[PDB]
Design a protein around this nucleic acid. Structure first.
Ligand SMILES: C[As](C)(=O)[O-]
Ligand SMILES: C[As](C)(=O)[O-]
Ligand SMILES: C[As](C)(=O)[O-]
Lengths: 68, 67, 68, 67, 67, 67
DNA sequence: TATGAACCGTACTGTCGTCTGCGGCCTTTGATTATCAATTAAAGCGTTCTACGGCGTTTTTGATCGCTCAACTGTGCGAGCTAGATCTCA
DNA sequence: TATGAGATCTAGCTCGCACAGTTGAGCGATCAAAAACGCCGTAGAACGCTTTAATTGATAATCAAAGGCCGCAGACGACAGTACGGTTCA
């Protein structure tokens, strides 16, 4: 669990939530981290397909146009 | 930009990336934050529909199954 | 409708079908052609992400590695 | 090899490809043929589950909802 | 949450678990219930495709093939 | 057969089934129980690998990512 | 990874509450026989679009070079994670 | 509407995110020889179309069976409250 809980809680709060449960925060944390991992994997596959070793923003933006 | 860059960089690195550009990190940050905001909004609408004011984990888990 | 109907009908026949409706054949034709177009499009985006303009088998296998 | 190569090449061309390798055409051919076989099999099982022996469009459209 | 927790806990116990967390029991409960709902839906689609209104064991056994 | 039939029947009913055969209920029961046993076993092996003896929800959530 | 150590947080015994399970009768739906049209297979026709090169040529993909740029030490001020009290919904 | 349940708030104690050069490396460039795709006219093997004709999938109606619903005795899942073996800290 690399992602911190507090900023995500602040996200849910900024979304319009009066009160936010810790379970919701941790859940959204694990979910967002999961999506991050998947998108990262796709971007890596893309960059590796592009003959490059460094992950650029292009790889992320292209990998994100395929769910998740 | 509520989400920090370093942990996300650690995510991309743990995914199998030898080197990661800062632009990629910031991009993935904005993307994850966007998804977070949207999902949070949906969960808020669900919980508000459920007669509750506090966002519980069920609201999140149900909201993510609406993408 | 780029794809011919008869070979696809022969595919359904080779699958184990005693009798095959024409509606089923044309339907499967439109479906397979649709899938083909989608996969081709994805492979094109992948190759275009690369330094190439020509679509190679790698692009096809990678686009099919992320589903139609 | 039930499927012809040329129409599929024309499909890739209609997708927006300037130049297309033969390997890509044959690969996409084998892939589309594979999917065709799988969907056909599923549709056959579907119709066989029913009181019919003939494969109708309904069976295909229902079998394709299994990816 | 239609499914009870205790029998599932007994399942995990019969699997070879010395001690079982309640979170694990509830998790496996919701998961198994989810799978049950999905399989039930598929079986319903199957029986409705078969021109019948009653869900028979055939529909379940065929719906569980997805897999 | 650790799992009860009635709640599963209520699941199939909640899925949209007008009428449900008892054979279908028992079948889905045995299926869900089977999946439960397999997933439980996998989770047990997972927890046994992690240096813990107690099965937590994490082990289940990781075991279900094998299907 | 090994030594403990404080503390979650289980297994536990036992009690209460609900839920299943089951046999009752009934109502509806499941196959089943029989009829009858829908339609799909089989063959044979004509015509098209396949597959196959031969060359001309766009396009790769080699190799080598500055060159931005990401990783990686160390630092300070920021940021989250925690513990406890108070209330606000659940 | 009564009560745990639990989320917000306050404060502070760390924790790791942010940052600034430094060093080294992967990246985009520059042409360049060569794989390799496109073009296109040719021979031919297909797809398509169509009528014969029989197998089939509906329709209709009668029969039997098989869930649904109701209600009851008994099973067992849920729920505190308490010693402790286990987990996750250091
Ligand atoms: C205090 As608020 C912005 O989470 O409603
Ligand atoms: C040759 As083209 C214009 O169909 O990509
Ligand atoms: C005693 As056991 C098989 O439930 O761990």
């Amino acid at each position: 669990m690399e992602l911190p809980i507090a900023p995500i809680g602040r996200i849910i709060k900024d979304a319009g939530a009066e009160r936010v449960s810790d379970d919701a925060r941790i859940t959204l944390a694990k979910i967002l981290e999961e999506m991050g991992r998947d998108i990262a994997s796709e971007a890596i596959k893309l960059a590796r397909h592009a003959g490059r070793k460094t992950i650029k923003a292009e790889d992320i933006e292209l990998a994100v146009r395929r769910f998740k």
